Amino acid sequence: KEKVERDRKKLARRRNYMPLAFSQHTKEIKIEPAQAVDEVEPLPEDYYTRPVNLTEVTTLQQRLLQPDFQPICASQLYPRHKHLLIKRSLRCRQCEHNLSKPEFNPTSIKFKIQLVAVNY
Amino acid sequence: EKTAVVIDLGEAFTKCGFAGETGPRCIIPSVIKKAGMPKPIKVVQYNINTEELYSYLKEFIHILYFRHLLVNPRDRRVVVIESVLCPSHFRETLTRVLFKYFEVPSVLLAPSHLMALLTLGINSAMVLDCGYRESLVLPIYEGIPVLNCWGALPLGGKALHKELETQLLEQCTVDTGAAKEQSLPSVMGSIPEGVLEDIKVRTCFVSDLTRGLKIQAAKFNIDGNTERPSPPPNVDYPLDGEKILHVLGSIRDSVVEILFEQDNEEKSVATLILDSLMQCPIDTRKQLAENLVIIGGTSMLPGFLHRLLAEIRYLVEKPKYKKTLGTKTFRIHTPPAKANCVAWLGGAIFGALQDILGSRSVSKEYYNQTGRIPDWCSL
Amino acid sequence: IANQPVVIDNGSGVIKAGFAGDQIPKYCFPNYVGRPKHVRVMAGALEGDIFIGPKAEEHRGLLSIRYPMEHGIVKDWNDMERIWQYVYSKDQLQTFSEEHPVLLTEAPLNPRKNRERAAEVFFETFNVPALFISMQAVLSLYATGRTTGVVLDSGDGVTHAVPIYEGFAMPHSIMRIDIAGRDVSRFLRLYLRKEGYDFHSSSEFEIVKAIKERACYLSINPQKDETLETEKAQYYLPDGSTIEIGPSRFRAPELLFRPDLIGEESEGIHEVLVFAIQKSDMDLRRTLFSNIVLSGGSTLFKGFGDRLLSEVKKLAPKDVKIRISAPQERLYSTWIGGSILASLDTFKKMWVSKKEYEEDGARSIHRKTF
Amino acid sequence: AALVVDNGSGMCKAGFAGDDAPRAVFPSIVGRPRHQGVMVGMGQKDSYVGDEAQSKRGILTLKYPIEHGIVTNWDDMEKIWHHTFYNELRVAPEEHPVLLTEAPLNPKANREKMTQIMFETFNTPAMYVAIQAVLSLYASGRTTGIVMDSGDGVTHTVPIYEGYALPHAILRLDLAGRDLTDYLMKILTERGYSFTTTAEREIVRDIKEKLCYVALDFEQEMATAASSSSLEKSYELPDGQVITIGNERFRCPEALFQPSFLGMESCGIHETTFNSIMKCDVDIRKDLYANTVLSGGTTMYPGIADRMQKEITALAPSTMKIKIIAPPERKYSVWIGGSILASLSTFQQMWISKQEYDESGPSIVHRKCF
Ligand SMILES: Nc1ncnc2c1ncn2[C@@H]1O[C@H](COP(=O)(O)OP(=O)(O)OP(=O)(O)O)[C@@H](O)[C@H]1O
Ligand SMILES: Nc1ncnc2c1ncn2[C@@H]1O[C@H](COP(=O)(O)OP(=O)(O)O)[C@@H](O)[C@H]1O
Ligand SMILES: Nc1ncnc2c1ncn2[C@@H]1O[C@H](COP(=O)(O)OP(=O)(O)O)[C@@H](O)[C@H]1O
Ligand SMILES: [Zn+2]
């Protein structure tokens, strides 16, 4: 709606007709806004008078690796899929190409175009 | 068009990922491991030389765009989330890094508070942002941030980490493993920030208002003989392998109280909402009060939201706020993502809107021509 | 009683006291109550829980500042009573309040409850012979020594424009806006956080007021100074640390002349002056433009008169003579006016006696005001 | 099929000709946001109008386009008419001919520029401007009698006898609802409750409409207000905060009957109604006393009719019988008249066409006005 309004406004400025009325001017999606709770759930009375095992609760580092629902308990914390790594290719400002890597960089130490300061 | 990337550079942690996603892909400590330096330098640092800041941000953004995210920087747009009243030179540098070095198409400098509002869907809401450095509040009414009625206090992560370190050094009881079974005080002169943060998260919790109010008067010792509630059991925390630090039960529930302590000035994390809300326009009062939003990782601390909402309703009855904010119904919003990743989620929801993004966002062609990033200060 | 009357300016920022005989106010100290920041249980700390004026300035960093008067209105009366008690202390004046009569200087169009309670305190708590509430604007003209003149009195709490012609004040033409020196200090703190220097504490708010008072110049064209690269002039703090203010210096006090920038719905300091003249009758407009007087502390900004003259000229009619006659003693102009007024034998008739207040009623103070 | 569109300074009453009451009634205001350089959220309209701006008052600066029945900003008025036809009424302006209302003795440029927009911008088939007072008589089924049509913008007194108007007997007074609203703010600020902003002024208008009532004897009412707290009523704001306005309740509408309070130096709404009848011919005066109509929403104050009768009777001769005509629908008295006029087959001829406008120009309106 804002795009159409901004487009209609911009082409009217570009035309420079001073908003001349040649023709007649002028389905809806409505989300319900989230309900506000009167009282949020208090801290459970267990936390008072209970030994805290540091094995059971999770550290920040391993909490934050699962960001979608970072759980306090270890039993909730599920193993995330292994992170894919990158194969870098360099390109200069003035020059175009410089160096690059093959399409089978897995289990290969070969460069498609070998270029380095020690090699010139 | 391609799915625009969202970055949110913070003092403690940086949120990173792609637009139109349920949460951020990578969230990591905002630091860089430079050769020679034993402890890694913090990437965001206010009030330093531009050249030294430029190099740190160049190093950091590189790690985000290749090791954490795997995508070409020049190809797709950027949605840089940064809090309102972020230092001028820092924001100017961050843009100059993205536009000059990386050569990004266009950056959009969204305020964190307005982004947090989009995630809920509500058009108007009060937004408290309890971060690392400063706990900032900013009323947002129907898309317009009200800078007139701003509020900030240094009662975040940094102020809490410092308070924990101080208390641990007073009641210092470590088992080094060298005839140190007996209580040994201050074997190490300072405790590293990484350890203090892990203790805070696991050991320490936020007490109830009734118990907290007693803890405040107890440590004060205001003409009373041992008027403290029964603390939790003492938790033993390993330091650098062999050294086992016994954390006192009092420290766990007293360290947090510095946030909710009045300290004569009447300036807590609780008061900051009511101080701001009283300064707001008379028509906006009832709408903002009903729609409260609590973002920031400091508010993740267990039982913070209950203590805050309770401490609010107690400070309401206090004679200062009793006239204006007397008969008001304070209700908290529960955002879809977790309290840490509310800010990021807004930028992603905004990044998914390709049509509006391109128009609002500052293009590289404009920056190269002008060299003037638009801000809420005069042009 | 014949004994010399005590003039006291009720300035939100700085209250100025002294005798009517003196050409200048001998005792002028900041209008705030100082209590210890940390809630003092123990001995060896700041004792009394009350530090006012010079005592507060000494131990400033330790104490917590709370202004009793906001926007020319008294919020906390218990605090204001302690302040007025410190005016009759060994430190300042050193006299009995029961002996000498009093003159107050309340801002124009204040609440009537503010005037009534102000009188009640000064008649009941202190046993004053006689009291007289007056307008800050009317006094400013007595000091300069002209009958005709518009008085743009920019204080710390409130900025107000009152047009008075040949000793006749048009009460409908008076204009009052809350955007004053204190708001400029608040907005400067925000811009200083945008430069990357936080002043979160109530004590640290006082040094932002000092930074403002020291270094803040009003540019004739604001847009040209923004494009121009700043010198970034260093200011020295009490601890010794240096801060480079830069562009925050000039774009902070601009909010007086353009309060829409931050988002405050007000007219502006250039606008209230012109509107006050335009609201008055057509015959007087020329003489009121020809006689403008700047009063208060929030006119002392470097190049204020230069900017105001330019901003008034474009709004005002073409080929009209605009003279903005600032005195050298703008900050202390309001008091000097009262000191002259008090000295006159006519003042003897104007004030309300203690016995008059007991018999007549509450109205006595309001009806004799004008 | 025809459209009646009252262009009142306070509220714009629009609807279809023949219908009993107007379809869409909204406050005539344009709401522009107090925007900073910070980016704005989604669902953002550049300028809000009417009930939308009335919902989002907090942030938007409310600017009334018509001031004293004179259109100051025509670009703003165009945006209201666009909200009137397209959004509120849900009708094309090209299809239906549009009747507008102008107050009597307005500037000639107002009627000229009004019709120019309707003919060029909206491309209406026919356009007729009418005097608000002339329409208001049709509501009561009375051809003979004077009307005291007091609006938010202006109040005017048009004597019409046996379907013939006396133009020279017409008197206009700039004192109106908005001046009373502005007056009520000042006296509420004197009590304690300060209202400055444009959004706050709208809340003071809601306070005025509900509580304020006209006193029979003002001096007698002030005596009862001082002694007892029976007249003191409480009102809840949009905020939970409640206020007790007290004597200022009946002090606001007094300004109508004695403008000296506002400081205009003019005759009261009672005295101007008398003066207008005396300016007329001696014979017809009888019927004008017998048929004194009160129109607009500034005559919906509880007990204005009783006070009006008393004041007129004192000025007028003793032998004459003075009857004030107060119909239940006074607020919609201007529109309901328009609906009756437009429906009549006789009025079909009096319409000014596009062909008539094109050949002659916008000056044709002055001939075929009344
Ligand atoms: N019941 C009421 N009692 C007192 N004052 C009222 C009442 N209703 C409205 N008012 C005041 O009087 C005004 C009446 O405005 P109204 O709705 O009659 O439109 P208008 O702009 O005056 O149109 P017109 O000039 O054609 O009569 C309002 O703006 C308000 O200030
Ligand atoms: N999941 C969590 N549980 C508890 N505390 C947390 C959590 N995540 C972060 N914190 C704490 O709260 C702080 C949140 O800071 P953050 O909002 O990420 O930084 P910034 O304010 O610079 O954007 C961290 O420094 C950390 O001490
Ligand atoms: N030399 C100065 N330069 C700039 N601002 C000043 C200067 N002196 C005072 N001010 C400002 O003006 C205020 C003083 O207001 P003041 O004139 O005392 O008000 P009042 O007329 O109500 O007594 C200070 O608090 C400060 O904000
Ligand atoms: Zn090269």
Residues D155 and D125 in one domain: no
Q: How far apart are CA D297 and CA D181, in angstroms?
A: 13
Q: Indicate if D142 and D106 belong to the same structural domain.
A: no
Residue C343's H or E segment, with its range, is helix C333-343
Give me the helices (H) in chain B, please: 50-63, 88-96, 112-120, 157-170, 193-202, 209-220, 249-254, 257-260, 269-279, 285-290, 304-317, 319-322, 343-351, 354-360, 364-370
CA distance D25 to D11: 7
Q: Which residue has the tokens 């008090």?
A: C342
Helix, strand or coil, per DSSP, at residue D201: helix
DSSP state of D261: G
Beta strands in chain B (DSSP E): 5-8, 13-18, 26-29, 31-32, 41-42, 78-82, 106-107, 110-111, 126-130, 135-137, 140-141, 144-145, 151-153, 174-175, 235-239, 243-247, 292-295, 362-363
- Closest ligand to C338 CA? 3
Distance CA D101, CA D130 (A): 5
Same domain for D81 and D230?
no
User: D304 and D158, same structural domain?
Assistant: yes
The token pair at C11 is: 């300035």
Most informative mutation of D25, D84, D152 for ligand 1 (most atoms within 8 A of CB): D152
Count Cβ atoms within 10 A of the Cβ of residue D32 and give its class: 0-12 exposed, 13-18 middle, 19 or more buried. middle
Among candidates C153, C117, C122, which has minimal Cα distance to C331?
A: C153
β-bridge mates for residue B26, sequence order: B16
Q: How far is D62 from chain C (nearest CA, A)?
A: 10
Q: Do D3 and D125 reside in the same domain of the chain?
A: yes
Q: In whole angstroms, what is the distance from residue B60 CA to residue D239 CA?
A: 48
D100 and D6 assigned to the same domain: yes
* Location of structure tokens 């520029």: D113
Atom of ligand 1 nearest to the CA of D330: 18
Distance, CA of D291 to CA of D307 (rounded, Å): 16
Chosen CATH of C179-266 out of 3.30.1010.10, 3.90.79.10, 3.40.1180.10, 3.90.640.10: 3.90.640.10
Residues D169 and D99: their CA atoms lie apart, in Å, by: 25
Considering only CA atoms, which of A57, A84, A58 is closest in space to residue B26?
A84
* Contact: D186, C260; criterion CB under 8 Å: no
> In C, which residues are within 8 Å of B150 by CB distance?
190
B140/B127 Cα distance (integer angstroms): 7
Using CA positions, which residue lies closest to atom 7 of ligand 2?
B297
* Coil, helix or strand at residue D119: helix
CATH code for position D245: 3.90.640.10
Q: Ligand 4: distance of its center to the CA of A94 in Å? A: 5
**Residue D271 CB-density burial (10 A; 0-12 exposed, 13-18 middle, 19+ buried):** middle
Neighbours of C27 (CB within 10 A): 20
Domain around D262: 175-266
Nearest-angstrom CA–CA distance, D180 and D173:
13
Radius of gyration of chain A (CA): 30
Nearest-angstrom CA–CA distance, B215 and B209 = 10
In a 13 Å sphere around the CA of C278, the CA atoms on its Cβ side amount to: 10
- Which residues on chain A place their C-beta less than 8 Å from a C-beta of chain B? 2-3, 6, 31-34, 36-43, 47-52, 54, 57, 59-60, 63-64, 67-70, 72, 84, 86, 88
Distance CA B369, CA D79 (A): 37
Q: Is C41's CB within 8 Å of B221's CB?
A: yes
Does 3.30.420.40 match the CATH number of domain C1-136+334-368? yes
Distance between CA atoms of D108 and D130, rounded to whole angstroms? 13
Tell me the sheet residues that pair with C126.
Answer: none
Are residue D22 and residue D168 in the same domain, yes or no?
A: no
All residues at 6 or more sequence positions from D271 whose CB lies less than 8 Å from its CB, including other chains: D311, D315
| Residue whose tokens read 């709208």 | D202
Distance from CA of D121 to the nearest CA of A (A): 6
User: Across the beta sheet with D24-27, what order do the strands follow?
Assistant: D24-27, D11-16, D3-7, D98-102, D126-131, D352-353
For residue D301, which of D189, D200, D181 has the smallest C-alpha distance? D181
- What is d(CA B216, CA D22) in angstroms, rounded to the nearest whole number? 64
SS3 content of chain B, % helix, strand, coil (to 5): 40, 15, 40
Same domain? For D113 and D225 the reply is no
User: Is the CB of residue C224 less than 8 Å from the CB of residue C281?
Assistant: no
B140 token code pair:
């947002």
* D34 touching chain C per CB within 8 A: yes
Pairing, β C159-164 against β C175-177: antiparallel
Interchain contact B/D (3 or more Cβ pairs less than 8 Å): yes
CB D221 within 8 A of CB D215: yes
Other Cβ atoms less than 10 A from the Cβ of C49: the count is 14
Q: Among the residues of B151-265, which ranges form H helices? A: 157-170, 193-202, 209-220, 249-254, 257-260
Give dist(CA B231, CA B343) in Å, integer: 35
**Closest by alpha carbon to B281, among D174, C43, C190, D198?**
D198
Residues, beta carbon < 5 Å, ion ligand 4? A 92, 94-95
On whether the CB atoms of residues D269 and D173 are closer than 8 A, the answer is yes
* Amino acid identity, position B342: V
Tell me the one-letter amino acid at C117.
R
What is the C-alpha separation between D330 and D177, in angstroms, rounded?
14
Residue identified by tokens 């110049």 is C217
Residues B191 and B165: beta-carbon distance below 8 Å = yes
Q: How many CA atoms lie within 13 A of D206 on its CB side?
A: 13
User: Fold match between C1-136+334-368 and C179-266?
Assistant: no
Q: What is the CA radius of gyration of chain B?
A: 23
CA-based nearest residue to B253, from B185, B304, B311, B291: B304
Reference C206, options C63, C80, C69, C73; nearest CA is: C63
Helix (H) or strand (E) holding D171: strand D171-173
D348 and D315 assigned to the same domain: no
Q: Which of B83, B225, B227, B264 to mutate to test the interface with C (most CBs of C within 10 A)?
A: B264
Mutation probe of ligand 3 site: the residue of C7, C8, C14 with most atoms within 8 A of C-beta: C14
Of all protein residues, the one whose alpha carbon is nearest to atom 27 of ligand 2 is: B157
d(CA B291, CA B330): 8
- Same domain, yes or no: D137 and D273: yes
| Rounded Cα distance, B60 and B29, in Å | 11
User: What's the CA gap between B197 and B218, in Å, rounded?
Assistant: 26
* C325 vs C270: CA distance, rounded Å: 15
Task: Kindly give the pairing relationship between strand D155-161 and strand D145-150.
Answer: antiparallel
Neighbours of D359 (CB within 10 A): 9
What would the two tokens of residue C150 be? 């518009």
Give the Cα separation of D231 and D303 in Å (integer).
15
Shared-domain flag, residues D195 and D240 = yes
Q: For residues C296 and B298, what is the distance between their CA atoms, to the nearest angstrom? A: 45
CB B132 within 8 A of CB B157: yes
Residue D158, classed as helix, strand or coil, is: strand
Residue keyed to tokens 């919902």: D55
- The structure tokens 């801060």 sit at C243
CB atoms closer than 10 angstroms to residue D132? 28
Q: Is the dihedral of CA A31, A32, A36, A40 positive or negative?
A: negative
Burial (CB count within 10 angstroms: exposed 0-12, middle 13-18, buried 19+), residue A96: exposed
Whether ligand 2 lies within 6 angstroms of the CB of B13 is answered as yes
Mutate to test the pocket of ligand 1, among D4, D5, D6, D11 (most ligand atoms within 8 A of CB): D11
What six digits make up the tokens of C47? 């004792």
Query: How many structural domains are present in chain D?
Result: 3
Measure the N-to-C terminal CA separation of chain A; round to a whole number of Å. 59
Q: Write phi, then psi, for B208 (nearest 5 degrees).
A: -70, 155
CA-based nearest residue to A67, from A56, A54, A78, A57: A78
Half-sphere exposure of A103 (CA within 13 A, CB side): 0
Q: Across the strands, what pairs with B82? A: B111
Q: How far apart are the first and last CA of chain C?
A: 22
Rounded to an integer, what distance in angstroms lies between the CA atom of residue B134 and that of residue B115?
Answer: 18
Residue D259 to residue D266: CA distance in whole angstroms: 6
Best residue of B283, B316, B378 to probe chain D, by most D CBs closer than 10 Å = B283
Fold of C137-178+267-333: Nucleotidyltransferase; domain 5 (3.30.420)
Nearest to D91 by CA among D125, D49, D57: D125
Distances (CA, A) of D127 to C164, D4, D13, D89, D356: 50, 10, 17, 17, 11
Token readout for B223 is: 């003409």
Cα C126 to ligand 3 centroid, rounded to whole Å: 28
Is there an interface between A and C (3+ Cβ pairs < 8 A)? no
Please give the Cα distance from C31 to C155 (Å, whole number).
13
Q: What angle do helix axes B112-120 and B343-351 make, rounded to 10 degrees? A: 80
DSSP string across D80-98: HHHIIIIIII---TTTS-E
Give, in degrees to the nearest 5, the angle at Cα B56 between B50 and B58: 95
Distance CA C306, CA D296 (A): 49
Parallel, antiparallel or unpaired: strands C352-353 and C14-19: unpaired
Cβ atoms D205, D235 nearer than 8 A: no
Q: Is D27 in the pocket of ligand 1 (CB under 6 A)?
A: no
Using CA of residue B251, residue B255, residue B257, residue B262, what is the dihedral sign?
Answer: positive
Q: ∠ CA D283-D285-D287 to the nearest 5 degrees?
A: 100
Identify the DSSP state of D160: E
> Residues B248, B251, B253, B254: is their CA dihedral positive or negative?
positive
Residues D14 and D159 in one domain: no
Look up residue C338 and give its amino acid.
Answer: G
The label of the residue with tokens 């410092």 reads: B162
Whole-angstrom distance, CA of residue C104 vs CA of residue B139: 39
Provide the residue ranges of all domains of chain C, joining segments of one domain with +. 1-136+334-368, 137-178+267-333, 179-266
Q: Which CATH architecture has domain B157-259?
A: Alpha-Beta Complex (3.90)
